[PDB]
């Protein structure tokens, strides 16, 4: 699995 | 599985 | 499964 | 599945 | 798994 | 699937 | 998938 | 998965 | 996955 | 995973 997050 | 966001 | 969210 | 999501 | 956050 | 958006 | 967003 | 994202 | 984002 | 981010 694989989570790329820009907030 | 893969997100990616940008919020 | 995979998702790109911009918001 | 898969989803693109704009907000 | 891999996760990349920008916050 | 491909999205591209200008607004 | 692939978006290219100008906001 | 890619995004290109200009705001 | 890659994601460019300029803002 | 890559991300270039400039903010
Ligand atoms: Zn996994
Ligand atoms: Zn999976
Ligand atoms: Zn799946
Ligand atoms: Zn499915
Ligand atoms: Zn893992
Ligand atoms: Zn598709
Ligand atoms: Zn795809
Ligand atoms: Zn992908
Ligand atoms: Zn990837
Ligand atoms: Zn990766």
Excluded: G
């Amino acid at each position: 699995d694989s989570v790329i997050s820009l907030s």
